């Protein structure tokens, strides 16, 4: 007899499972709208004066942080925050009044081994390998209007190279890009062989390969970029009590195992008590950047960089 609307940036089948299970557990009529991180961020900004959802589940965390700075989020600290991996303690001190961490993702390349043979080039192992002229028209990555992935790409390259060389690299990469599309289409196009290599979070490439696509994952040489999955309650939510229960729910260990146990999707749990699938990469074995989520969570910085992508890249 209660209600709840979830803006959902995790996979559609996971959104469906999460909301259906919650609805039965609490007798709450639960609806969701699925969208990329940038898509949902845009909706929340546009709907500020009359919100159409109560909680935003999933998506890269810097747009969540930015929404918080813009006054778009409710303050609420779930008791389940205590179970977040301790490496995120300091970040949750600064941002956790309005955004919680519910998973993590590693940024890498997906490559279609069949397309690779057809182009006659070896699988790329470095960022600069993607600039090979043999890759003209064969690279895809997501459009930053819809996709938090592409903001993570920008932030990764800026931390690796400095901003000037980051945008120099992206301009050279743009010459090999066929089109920028929604992240899930990037993944689908790679599996089908419309593209030869893509940049994105690597859990999707593990799922694609397990489901029979000729796709391999590459962790690019050098420092590794990554993302956190955010969850935030929307300011002036219609259904605040149910939004808090849903927040507690997605912060719980069992809920963070449901993606791999029930859907073969491999976002890495951030609840210290949850078990990860062996198909997820282990970030502890990678050369992670000391990723400055707090800096790129600035609303000023996020808008400046998205506008700069749109003006300088295309
Ligand atoms: C669980 C999850 N979170 C976040 C993302 C990022 O999606 P997008 O780049 O469209 O914002 C993805 C897509 O790869 C995803 O599968």
Author numbering: 1 to 314
How did the manuscript describe this experimental structure?
In this study, we structurally characterized P5PA and found it to be a type II periplasmic binding protein capable of binding the active form of vitamin B6 (P5P). The periplasmic binding protein sequesters a specific substrate and recruits it to the permease–ATPase plasma membrane complex, which uses ATP hydrolysis to induce substrate influx from the periplasm into the cytosol. P5PA is encoded by the p5pAB operon in A. pleuropneumoniae. In this study, we illustrate that P5PA transports P5P, making it the first reported transporter for the active form of vitamin B6 in prokaryotes.
The purified protein was crystalized and subjected to X-ray crystallographic characterization. Using molecular replacement (MR) with AfuA as a model, the structure of “APJL_RS02700” was solved and refined to a resolution of 1.75 Å (see Experimental procedures section and Table 1). The resulting high-resolution structure revealed a typical type II periplasmic binding protein with two β-strands connecting two globular domains. However, the binding cleft located above the β-strands at the interface of the two globular domains revealed clear positive density indicating a possible copurifying ligand. Further in silico screening of potential ligands containing six-member rings and phosphate groups indicated that the active form of vitamin B6, called PLP/P5P, best fit in the unmodeled electron density. The model of P5PA with P5P in the binding pocket reveals a network of hydrogen bonds and hydrophobic clefts that primarily hold the pyridine ring and phosphate group of P5P in place. While Tyr103 interacts with the pyridine ring nitrogen and His203 coordinates the pyridine hydroxyl group, the phosphate group of P5P is stabilized by collective interactions with the side chains of Thr37, Ser147, Thr149, and Ser183 and the backbones of Thr37, Thr149, and Gly148. In addition, the dipole created the N terminus of three alpha helices beginning at residues Thr37, Gly148, and Ser183, respectively, and create a positive environment for the negatively charged phosphate on P5P. Moreover, the hydrophobic interactions with Gly36, Leu105, and Gln267 contributed to retaining the P5P molecule within this binding pocket. We determined a dissociation constant (Kd) of 36 ± 7 nM, which suggests that there is a strong interaction between P5PA and P5P. Our structural analysis of P5PA suggests that it is a highly specific transporter for P5P and does not possess the capacity to transport G6P because of a lack of hydrophobic interactions required to mediate binding of G6P.
